[PDB]
Amino acid sequence: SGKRYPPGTSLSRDCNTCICRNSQWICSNEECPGECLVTGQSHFKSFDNRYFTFSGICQYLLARDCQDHSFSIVIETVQCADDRDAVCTRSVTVRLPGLHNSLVKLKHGAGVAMDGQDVQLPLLKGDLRIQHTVTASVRLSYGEDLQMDWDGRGRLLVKLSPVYAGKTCGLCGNYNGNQGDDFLTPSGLAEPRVEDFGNAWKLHGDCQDLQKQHSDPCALNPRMTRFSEEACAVLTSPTFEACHRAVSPLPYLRNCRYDVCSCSDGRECLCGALASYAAACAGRGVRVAWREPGRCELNCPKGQVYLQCGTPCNLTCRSLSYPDEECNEACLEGCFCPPGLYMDERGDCVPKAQCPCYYDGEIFQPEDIFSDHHTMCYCEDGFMHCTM
Amino acid sequence: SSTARCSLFGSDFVNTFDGSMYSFAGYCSYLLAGGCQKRSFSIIGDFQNGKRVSLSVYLGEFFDIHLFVNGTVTQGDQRVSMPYASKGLYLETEAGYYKLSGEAYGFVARIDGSGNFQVLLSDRYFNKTCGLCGNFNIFAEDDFMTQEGTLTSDPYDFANSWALSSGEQWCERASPPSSSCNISSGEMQKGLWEQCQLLKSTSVFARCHPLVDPEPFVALCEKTLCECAGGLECACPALLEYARTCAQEGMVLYGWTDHSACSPVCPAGMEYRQCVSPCARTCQSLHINEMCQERCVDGCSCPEGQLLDEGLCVESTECPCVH
Amino acid sequence: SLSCRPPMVKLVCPADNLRAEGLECTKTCQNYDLECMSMGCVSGCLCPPGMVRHENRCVALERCPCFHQGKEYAPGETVKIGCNTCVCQDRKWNCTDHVCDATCSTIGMAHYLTFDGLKYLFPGECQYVLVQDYCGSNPGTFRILVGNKGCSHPSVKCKKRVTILVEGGEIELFDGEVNVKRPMKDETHFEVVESGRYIILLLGKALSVVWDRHLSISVVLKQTYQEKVCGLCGNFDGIQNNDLTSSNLQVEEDPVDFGNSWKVSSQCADTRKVPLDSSPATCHNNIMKQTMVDSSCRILTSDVFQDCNKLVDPEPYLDVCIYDTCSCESIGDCACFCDTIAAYAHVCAQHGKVVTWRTATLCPQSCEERNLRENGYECEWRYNSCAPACQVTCQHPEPLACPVQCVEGCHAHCPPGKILDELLQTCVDPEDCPVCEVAGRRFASGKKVTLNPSDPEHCQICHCDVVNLTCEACQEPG
Amino acid sequence: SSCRILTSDVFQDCNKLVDPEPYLDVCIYDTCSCESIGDCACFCDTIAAYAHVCAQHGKVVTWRTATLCPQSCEERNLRENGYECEWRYNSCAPACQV
Numbered sequence A: 001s002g003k004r005y006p007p008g009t010s011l012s013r014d015c016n017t018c019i020c021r022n023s024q025w026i027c028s029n030e031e032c033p034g035e036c037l038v039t040g041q042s043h044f045k046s047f048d049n050r051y052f053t054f055s056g057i058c059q060y061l062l063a064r065d066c067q068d069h070s071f072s073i074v075i076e077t078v079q080c081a082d083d084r085d086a087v088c089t090r091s092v093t094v095r096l097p098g099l100h101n102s103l104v105k106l107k108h109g110a111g112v113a114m115d116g117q118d119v120q121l122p123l124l125k126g127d128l129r130i131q132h133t134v135t136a137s138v139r140l141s142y143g144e145d146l147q148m149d150w151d152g153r154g155r156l157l158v159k160l161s162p163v164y165a166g167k168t169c170g171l172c173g174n175y176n177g178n179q180g181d182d183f184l185t186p187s188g189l190a191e192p193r194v195e196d197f198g199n200a201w202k203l204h205g206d207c208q209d210l211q212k213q214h215s216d217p218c219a220l221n222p223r224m225t226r227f228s229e230e231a232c233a234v235l236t237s238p239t240f241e242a243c244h245r246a247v248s249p250l251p252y253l254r255n256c257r258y259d260v261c262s263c264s265d266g267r268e269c270l271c272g273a274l275a276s277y278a279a280a281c282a283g284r285g286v287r288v289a290w291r292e293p294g295r296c297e298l299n300c301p302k303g304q305v306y307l308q309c310g311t312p313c314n315l316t317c318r319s320l321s322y323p324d325e326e327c328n329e330a331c332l333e334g335c336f337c338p339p340g341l342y343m344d345e346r347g348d349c350v351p352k353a354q355c356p357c358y359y360d361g362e363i364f365q366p367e368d369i370f371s372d373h374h375t376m377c378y379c380e381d382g383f384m385h386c387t388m
Numbered sequence B: 001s002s003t004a005r006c007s008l009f010g011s012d013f014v015n016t017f018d019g020s021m022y023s024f025a026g027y028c029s030y031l032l033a034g035g036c037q038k039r040s041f042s043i044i045g046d047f048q049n050g051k052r053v054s055l056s057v058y059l060g061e062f063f064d065i066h067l068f069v070n071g072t073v074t075q076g077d078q079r080v081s082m083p084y085a086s087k088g089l090y091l092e093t094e095a096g097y098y099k100l101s102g103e104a105y106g107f108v109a110r111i112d113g114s115g116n117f118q119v120l121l122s123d124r125y126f127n128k129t130c131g132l133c134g135n136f137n138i139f140a141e142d143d144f145m146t147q148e149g150t151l152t153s154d155p156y157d158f159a160n161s162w163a164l165s166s167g168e169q170w171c172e173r174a175s176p177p178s179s180s181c182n183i184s185s186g187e188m189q190k191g192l193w194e195q196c197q198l199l200k201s202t203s204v205f206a207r208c209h210p211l212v213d214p215e216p217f218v219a220l221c222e223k224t225l226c227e228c229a230g231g232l233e234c235a236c237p238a239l240l241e242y243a244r245t246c247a248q249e250g251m252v253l254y255g256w257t258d259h260s261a262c263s264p265v266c267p268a269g270m271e272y273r274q275c276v277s278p279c280a281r282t283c284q285s286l287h288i289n290e291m292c293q294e295r296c297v298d299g300c301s302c303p304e305g306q307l308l309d310e311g312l313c314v315e316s317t318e319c320p321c322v323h
Numbered sequence C: 001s002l003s004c005r006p007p008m009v010k011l012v013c014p015a016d017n018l019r020a021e022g023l024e025c026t027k028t029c030q031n032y033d034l035e036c037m038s039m040g041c042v043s044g045c046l047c048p049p050g051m052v053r054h055e056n057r058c059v060a061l062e063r064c065p066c067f068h069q070g071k072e073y074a075p076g077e078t079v080k081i082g083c084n085t086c087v088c089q090d091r092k093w094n095c096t097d098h099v100c101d102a103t104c105s106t107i108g109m110a111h112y113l114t115f116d117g118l119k120y121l122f123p124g125e126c127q128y129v130l131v132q133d134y135c136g137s138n139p140g141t142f143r144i145l146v147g148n149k150g151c152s153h154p155s156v157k158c159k160k161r162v163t164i165l166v167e168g169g170e171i172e173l174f175d176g177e178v179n180v181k182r183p184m185k186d187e188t189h190f191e192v193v194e195s196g197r198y199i200i201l202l203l204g205k206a207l208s209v210v211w212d213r214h215l216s217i218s219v220v221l222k223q224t225y226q227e228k229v230c231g232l233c234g235n236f237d238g239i240q241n242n243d244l245t246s247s248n249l250q251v252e253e254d255p256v257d258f259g260n261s262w263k264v265s266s267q268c269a270d271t272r273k274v275p276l277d278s279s280p281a282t283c284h285n286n287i288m289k290q291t292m293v294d295s296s297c298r299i300l301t302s303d304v305f306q307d308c309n310k311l312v313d314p315e316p317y318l319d320v321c322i323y324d325t326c327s328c329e330s331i332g333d334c335a336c337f338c339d340t341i342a343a344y345a346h347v348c349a350q351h352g353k354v355v356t357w358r359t360a361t362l363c364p365q366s367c368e369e370r371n372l373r374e375n376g377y378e379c380e381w382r383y384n385s386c387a388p389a390c391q392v393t394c395q396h397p398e399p400l401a402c403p404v405q406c407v408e409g410c411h412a413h414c415p416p417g418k419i420l421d422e423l424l425q426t427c428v429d430p431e432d433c434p435v436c437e438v439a440g441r442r443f444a445s446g447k448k449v450t451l452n453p454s455d456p457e458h459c460q461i462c463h464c465d466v467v468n469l470t471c472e473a474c475q476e477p478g
Numbered sequence D: 001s002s003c004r005i006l007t008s009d010v011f012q013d014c015n016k017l018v019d020p021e022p023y024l025d026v027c028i029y030d031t032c033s034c035e036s037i038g039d040c041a042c043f044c045d046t047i048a049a050y051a052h053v054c055a056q057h058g059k060v061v062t063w064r065t066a067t068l069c070p071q072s073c074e075e076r077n078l079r080e081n082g083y084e085c086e087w088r089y090n091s092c093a094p095a096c097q098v
C-alpha cells in the first residue's frame, strides 16, 4: 500500500496473516467469514464482496442454506418515499427449522415478533439469542455460525462462518470466494442483467417485476444535484484518509448520490451512508472521527455521553447480576455514560447502589430480603447473594 | 390546437392542461411540468407560504433560472440582468410582462405584474408529461396521477407528492388553511354573489359556453370572495382567468374589462389591451415587416403613438440615438 | 361469489393447523423451489398439489419453462452462452463444462480488463508486464509486455509500445507496423494476419494477440494454462476477485499500487494516487461539458445496441468513455471517443451480434484511398461492419487458427475466382499467387522454414521461395 | 499546432495568394470554445472554408486523409443491392453540371 516494511514483519488482514521473506509476502489461504449487507435504499452487498442495486417491491429471498436447511432469510421491500427510485427495507423474516420450525420477524422499529407474539429482549432460548446492542439495535445470534443486525430503518447484516462455504443460495450468493457467479438464478445459470436476478427470487407472483434499474434519480429532482456533490465529497476528503487503503470508497460514494437524491429527507440519508463506510473501515481496523455539529453528531440523552470506542460489557445493570458470563465483544461506538454510572432500564444510568437485580428474570429492587423456607437470598448492589 | 396551457392564477389556485381546477397553498418548491420517463427540462414553482414567489426552469443538470414576480432574475446564485439568452432560453419581456421561451425544448412560460404563472407547452408531450399541471391528454378527470402513478380523488395530497427539496431548505407537507370565512359569513355572500355571477349573465361572456363551462370558475371564486374585506375586485382574478382560457381555445373575447371595474396591473404609461401583437414597434427598431406572423397575445402596451424605449412609453418625436 | 374453475379446487383454513399454507403461498413456477411465509390461508381456489399456476393458466405437468433473460424456453430447448451449450431438464438449466478462451483488453488509454473480468483504472507512464508465464514455479515461456509514454492523462499523446518475448524472440510493434528485432526459433507457429483494422498475430497453439493499430491490446489464451500466468491481467483461474495479486504475492485493494508492482524499470516514476472523483480534469467544474459527453456516450445504450446490451453489460464500457474523452482534448482526431465504442462493438461481435453503428456524421472511417494506386478505379475496398479476419490469401492460402470470428475495417471484396494479395493491393487470380506444392502435398505458399530437423538419414529437405519445384541437399554431420 | 495545417506543405501554393492569418485566428477561437467529442466538425469546417477560397483562385487542394477529417461517401452506394460504386469524395469538382 505504498509504504515499506522490514523483513520478518507479520501484518494481518482481517482474514489472515502474511509475513515478509525475500521481498515476497507468504500468506495463508484459510477461509474467513462473509457479510451480506443490505442498507440505504436498495443497496446490497453479496458475501463475495460484490456490490449492486435492485429496486424491486416484493418479498425476496436474501439467503438460505441450500444443501441442508438450517435456516432461511427473507427480505421485504417497499417503496419508501415519493420517488420511484426509493425502495427501502421494511422488515425481514427469519426461519429456523431446527427449533419448532419457528418464524422470527424483525419489524420496522427495533422490535421482534416470534410467531405473532411480540417479545421483550433478551430472548435466551436454547440456541438463538436476541438482544439489543446499543439499546437502539437488535442482534440475533443463532448458535455460533450466524449473526444479524437491526432491520428497523433498513441496515440488515449477516455473519456466516466458513462452515457454510459454498452451500447457500439467494440474492447474497454462494459464499465461495468468486465474485462473478453471484448473479446465478435458481435455475443454475448466471444472468448478466440484475433486473433478471432479483425478480427470480421473489416469492409471490402477483408482485410487479421491474424492467430497468435506474442509476441517476437526481434527474427527477434536479434540486439535489448540487447538494449531493458537496455532501458526500467528504467521503474522499482526508477525513477518511486512514481507510482508503482498507476498503474501496468509490461504491459507498456511488450509493450516497442515489440515496440523497431519492429519499424524503436527505439529512439522515446522508449520515446513514457515511456511516456505512466507517462501519466497514472499522470492520478492518481503522476507526475514523467524522462527527461534527454539522456532520450529524447524534444526541445522546442527558444521562449518557457520546463515545467513540468503548466497552459494551460493564454498561448494563444486568451485567452485575450475571458477572461470570463472558463478554467477548469489540470496542464499539455509541452512547455510554461514565464508568461510575451503570445503565438502568428507564434510560437514566445510575451508580451500582440502586442497580437492581435480575434473579430468575424477576427484577428486584436494590434492597429486597427474600426467602423460601430453605433458601435465603438478597440483592445488595446489582448481584443476588443467595445461600442455602 | 398543437399546444397546451397551465395557469396558477390568483392566490393558491391552479388550472391544469385539461379543465381541472383546485387550490393549493404550498410551502416549498413543486414540479409544474416536465417529462416523466426522461426529463430534458423541468418547470418548477416556489411558494413561500401559500403565496407564490418564483418560476424556475432546470434544464436537466447543468443550468437553472429563477425569475420571480419580483423579476430580479438569477442564474444559479449570480443575479444577472435582463434580457438574457443563454443555452437556448430567451428571457425577454412581452407586453410589459416577463417571458421565458424555450421553443427548442417546447415551452413558453411567463408571469404578469400581479403574479400569475402560465405554461404554454407543445403537443410533443401528449400523454407524456406528469406534474402539478397534470398530463396533456384529452380527459380532465384522470389528471391526478401521482409520482408513483395513482389516480387520487384528492386535489391536495397529489400536489404534495410532486415536491422537490434542496440543501438550502428541506420542506414538509403543508396543511390546508383553516378558513376564517366560516364564522365571518354575514352579508358578504349576498351582495357579492353577483361579481361571480356575471361570468354567466353578461353577454360578453355569454358565448364561450359552447367552448368551455364557467361552472368551475364560479365554483372556485365563491370560496375566495369571503376572506377579503370590502371589495368587489376580489372576483376579477378568477374572472381574468376565464378570459384567457377561452382565448387559447380559438375564440377570443373583446372589451370585457370596460365595465368589469377591474383592470390587471401594469406599470406607468401602459394599460391592459387585449390581443396586441408581440412584435411591439419600439423606438430603436428596424422597420422590417412580415416576419412576425406569430399568434396574437394579451397584455398591456403603449398608446397609438408613444413608442417604447427602456420600459416606458415615449413620444415618437423624442426617439434617441445610441453610440 | 364465484365458483372457481374445474381444473382446481377450493381450500379452507383448518382451525387446528397453523400451517395453513393455502392461497398466500401460491406456488408458481418461480417460487416452487423457494420457501414461503404464511400466516393463514384465504378464501381462494388453489391448484391441486400436482400442478402450479402459469400466467393465468394452471399448467398441469411440471414441464413449465426455464427462464433466461426474462424469456420462455420449453423443456429440451437449448441456449448458447459462451462456448457452451446448455439445456433445461429438471426445470434447471443443464450446461456443459468446456471453459472458454479468455481475453485481456486495454479499453482506452488507461484501463485494463482482466481474463476473469475486472475493469480497473491504472494510469502509468513506465513499462509494465501485461501478462507472462514466469510466475512463481514455472518455466517462463512468454513475457508479453506493454509500455506507454505520456499516458497518465489520456489525449492525442499516449502512443503504446509492445514488446512480446516468446521462444527466445523479440518481435515488437509501435507506430502502426510490427518489427522483428530477434526472430524466434520455431518459425512454424508464427503468423501475422493484417486483416482489416487489426493486426491479428498468432504465436503458438494457445496464444494470440490483437492490435487495432492505435491502442488496444487483446491477448487471447486457451484452456491450456488455467492458473499458470500472472501480470496486470491476473492469473486466469475463474476466481474474479484475486486478480490484484501483486508481484510480492498478496492481494491489494487499490489498483494504483498494483501496477506499480509490475513495472520493469524499478527506478522510473511510480504513478500518483489520484483523489477520487466522478469528474476528470477537463470535466472538473465544467458541468456543462460533462453532460454533452455523457449524452454522447449513451450511444452505448441506443436503438442499434439494444441486442447486445442484454448480453454484455455496457456500464464498464461507459465509465471508460466519460473518463477518456473528458481528459482527451480531441481537436482534429475524434479517436479517443470513436475507439471506446468500437471496443464495445467488437465484444458484441464475438457473441454473434454484428452491429452497424458508424455513420457519416459520427466516426466516418472511409476506405477510398486503397482504391487509388490504380488509375482505373476498380472499387473492391469497402468498410465492412464485421467481416471474417481469417481468410485465404496468396501469402496465407491455408486456413489459420482463428481466435477472432470477425473484425471491423476496410475489407477487399471482388467476385470469385480471384484471391487477395496485400503487396499488389487488388485481388488477383489464384495462379498469380507465388504458391508452392513440392512433391505433391498441400501446404502454405512456400514458408521460409527448414523442415525435418529430427532424423539425419531422412533429411530430405525441400524449400520453396515463391514458385520453384526445388529440393536442397542436406549437409552431412560426418 | 493542429491549426498550422493552414501553413503546411499541401497549402504552400495557396498561402502565397490568400493570407492564412485570418483563417487561423478563427481556428484557434472555435475549437478552444468548442468541446469536440464525437464530431470534430468545429475544426474540419474552418480548414475547408480556407480550401474552398483557395479553389476559387484555381488552386485545388487535397488535404483530407483517413486520420484527419475522413468524409466517406459509401452510403449513397448502398440502396442498390449491386454495389455500382459511382459516388466518390472528389477534391474540388464542378458544381454546375447537367
Ligand SMILES: *[C@@H]1O[C@H](CO)[C@@H](O)[C@H](O)[C@H]1NC(C)=O
Residues within 6 Å of the ligand: B053, B068, B070, B072
Ligand atoms: C425580491 O427582490 C429583492 C430585491 O432584489 C430581494 O432583496 C428579495 O430577496 C426578493 N424576494 C423574493 C421573494 O424574491
Ligand SMILES: *[C@@H]1O[C@H](CO)[C@@H](O)[C@H](O)[C@H]1NC(C)=O
Residues within 6 Å of the ligand: B127, B137, B138
Ligand atoms: C398513452 O395515452 C393513451 C391515450 O392518451 C392511453 O390510452 C395509453 O394507455 C397511454 N400509454 C401509456 C404507456 O400510458
Ligand SMILES: *[C@@H]1O[C@H](CO)[C@@H](O)[C@H](O)[C@H]1NC(C)=O
Residues within 6 Å of the ligand: C089, C094, C095
Ligand atoms: C445433463 O444431462 C445429461 C445427459 O442427459 C445428464 O447425464 C446430466 O446428469 C445432466 N446434468 C445434470 C447437472 O444433472
Ligand SMILES: *[C@@H]1O[C@H](CO)[C@@H](O)[C@H](O)[C@H]1NC(C)=O
Residues within 6 Å of the ligand: C382, C383, C384, C385, C386, C387, C388
Ligand atoms: C458486410 O459483410 C457482411 C458479411 O460478410 C455482408 O453480409 C454485408 O453485405 C457487408 N456489408 C457491406 C456494407 O458491404
Ligand SMILES: *[C@@H]1O[C@H](CO)[C@@H](O)[C@H](O)[C@H]1NC(C)=O
Residues within 6 Å of the ligand: C465, C466, C467, C468, C469, C470, C471
Ligand atoms: C528456387 O531455388 C533455387 C535454389 O535451388 C534458386 O536458385 C531459384 O532461384 C529459386 N527459384 C525461385 C523462383 O525463387
Ligand SMILES: *[C@@H]1O[C@H](CO)[C@@H](O)[C@H](O)[C@H]1NC(C)=O
Residues within 6 Å of the ligand: D090, D091, D092, D093, D094
Ligand atoms: C474528380 O477528380 C478529378 C481528379 O481526381 C478531377 O480531374 C475532376 O475534375 C473531378 N471531378 C470530375 C467530375 O471529374
Ligand SMILES: [Ca+2]
Residues within 6 Å of the ligand: A048, A173, A174, A175, A176, A177, A178, A179, A180, A181, A182
Ligand atoms: Ca459466489
Ligand SMILES: [Ca+2]
Residues within 6 Å of the ligand: B016, B017, B018, B134, B135, B136, B137, B138, B139, B140, B141, B142, B143
Ligand atoms: Ca388531463
Ligand SMILES: [Ca+2]
Residues within 6 Å of the ligand: C116, C234, C235, C236, C237, C238, C239, C240, C241, C242, C243
Ligand atoms: Ca483471478
Ligand SMILES: [Ca+2]
Residues within 6 Å of the ligand: none
Ligand atoms: Ca455460428
Ligand SMILES: [Ca+2]
Residues within 6 Å of the ligand: none
Ligand atoms: Ca480557367
